[PDB]
């Protein structure tokens, strides 16, 4: 996963998963890579893309 450029199209401070983050990332191989919340204040709804 190289050149993962993330733009936050959706950001509400709300109770649900109010973060909508579109990361254009270049995959070296086709597969499910884990998504890790680097921010403790965020919660990634999905796990592997």
């Amino acid at each position: 996963l190289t050149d993962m450029s993330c733009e936050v199209p959706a950001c509400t401070h709300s109770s649900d998963f109010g973060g909508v983050a579109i990361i254009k990332y270049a995959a070296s191989k086709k597969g499910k890579c884990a998504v890790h919340s680097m921010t403790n204040a965020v919660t990634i709804r999905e796990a592997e893309i």
């Binding site: 199209p9 959706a10 909508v20 579109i22």
Partner: protein, 49 residues
């Protein structure tokens, strides 16, 4: 009988009686509140970029 309100209508009104109604009274600010449905509100994940 003289000129009536149909001729002498100041303010750009359109006076028409029986019932007495000034259609096209060109004056004021018209407060209109549109409570619209939520279904039009398609966010950036839904929208074209």
């Amino acid at each position: 009988r003289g000129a009536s309100l149909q001729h002498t209508a100041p303010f750009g009104c359109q006076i028409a009686t029986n019932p007495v109604r000034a259609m096209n009274c060109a004056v004021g600010n018209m407060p209109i509140s549109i409570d619209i449905p939520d279904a039009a509100f398609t966010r950036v994940v839904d929208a074209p970029s």
